[PDB]
């Protein structure tokens, strides 16, 4: 069981946004939901506790609700100090554990949205002769600065050996990110293809490389 959050939420200054948190009966369905705001580099701060309560100091522009197996955090009148990462959390009875959602990056939109382009490099001959293999997936020119990256060997997802950077700004004021898939020279030569899939807003773009081609 996992708590599911969308990677990105956004609006222009003054707009409202809703951040969803979706779970199941073992957690959100029966247990209290908490929400946190984090600026990277510093610890999270409580935004909502016990589904819908606000601590002292959190403005009433923030409100939490829960229905069935889902919870949502509503933010009205978006301002710069609201930007950052938002996480939901809840106890899960089947796991006897506190689960966290994966985090939603909240962006106050300052420029038009922009879809990523993806470049995928196969392992270099140099690296292969060193008995190693890294696929390099470079993601560029997107806004807002939040993406999901997934890898496939042929047509099946692969999770092991993956590292992905947090997006940072390019010289043209859009965002870039990178992801790596580490393989053995054996795996690289034995599959027909490998792909990196990049999800941004409501598009997924996938690039593929094959060991038998340029």
């Amino acid at each position: 069981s996992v708590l599911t959050q969308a990677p990105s939420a956004s609006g222009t200054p003054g707009q409202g946004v809703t951040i969803a948190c979706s779970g199941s009966n073992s957690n959100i369905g029966n247990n209290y939901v908490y929400w946190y705001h984090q600026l990277p580099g510093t610890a999270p701060k409580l935004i909502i506790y016990t589904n819908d309560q606000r601590p002292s100091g959190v403005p009433d522009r923030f409100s939490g609700s829960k229905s069935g197996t889902s919870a949502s955090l509503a933010i009205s009148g978006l301002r710069s100090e609201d930007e950052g990462d938002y996480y939901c959390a809840a106890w899960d009875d089947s796991l006897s554990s506190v689960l966290f959602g994966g985090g939603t990056k909240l962006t106050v939109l300052r420029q038009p949205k922009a879809a990523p382009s993806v470049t995928l490099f196969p392992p270099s001959s140099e690296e292969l002769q060193a008995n190693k293999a890294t696929l390099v997936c470079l993601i560029s020119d997107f806004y807002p600065g939040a993406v999901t990256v997934a890898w496939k060997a042929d047509s099946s997802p692969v999770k092991a050996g993956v590292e992905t950077t947090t997006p940072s700004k390019q010289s043209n004021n859009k965002y870039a990110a990178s992801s790596y898939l580490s393989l053995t020279p054996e795996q690289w030569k034995s599959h027909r293809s490998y792909s990196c899939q990049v999800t941004h807003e409501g598009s997924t773009v996938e690039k593929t490389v094959a060991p038998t081609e340029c």
């Binding site: 554990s97 506190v98 966290f100 985090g103 590292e163 992905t164 950077t165």
Partner: protein
């Protein structure tokens, strides 16, 4: 105000172990359950352990069961985390929490057997078909160095337009890797030399790597 002060973090070797302490003030510590939560560099939040107000009940993440022990001393208003058999997946900032309400500023725990190591630099060759008309991306993969930082430049600083150098990933080995990419005219791949200049001062290593087109 509520204050939670963590200590006891730092660098430790894999299989080793460490003792986090969290000292509480501004609330009746013994009334409240406590939790530990951690955050691997670049990643989300992951709960680690719960302990009841009296200390008699504990719960652990499956990722940590049998390896960590949470405890508390209500006479000293202190929460502890005994982390045994430390492994690279445990590298994270560790936060103490009162209930799920207030977080300490966090203590960094680094689990690595890495010593100083200069990078291996590999070329990211431009695809031969995007070398006729239009633009092409090429780059350098800077692999397996420790510690941070490295610097990357292109053509000794003469090439800056179209360059993006990415931040590093921290791998399960404890070593870092990053990449640098530059977009150039396809027509220049025949005539223009492209060299990435990598500098890793902690190991007193500099690497220049020529990036050439591949013969498909």
């Amino acid at each position: 105000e509520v204050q939670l002060v963590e200590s006891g973090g730092g660098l430790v070797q894999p299989g080793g172990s460490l003792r986090l302490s969290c000292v509480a003030s501004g609330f009746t510590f013994s009334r409240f359950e406590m939790n530990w939560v951690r955050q691997a560099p670049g990643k989300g939040l992951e709960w680690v352990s719960y302990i009841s107000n009296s200390g008699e009940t504990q719960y652990y993440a499956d990722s940590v069961k049998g390896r960590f022990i949470v405890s508390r001393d209500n006479a000293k208003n202190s929460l502890y985390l005994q982390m045994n058999s430390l492994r690279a997946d445990d590298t994270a900032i560790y936060y103490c929490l009162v209930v799920l309400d207030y977080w300490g500023q966090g203590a960094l725990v680094t689990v690595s057997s890495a010593s100083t190591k200069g990078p291996s630099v590999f070329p990211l060759a431009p695809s031969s078909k995007s070398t006729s008309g239009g633009t092409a991306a090429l780059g350098c993969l800077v692999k397996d160095y420790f510690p941070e930082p490295v610097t990357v430049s292109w053509n000794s600083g003469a090439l800056t337009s179209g360059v993006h150098t990415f931040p590093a990933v921290l791998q399960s080995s404890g070593l870092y890797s990053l990449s640098s990419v530059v977009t150039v005219p396809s027509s220049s791949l025949g005539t223009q030399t492209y060299i990435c200049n990598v500098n890793h001062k902690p190991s007193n290593t500099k690497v220049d790597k020529k990036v050439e087109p591949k013969s498909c």
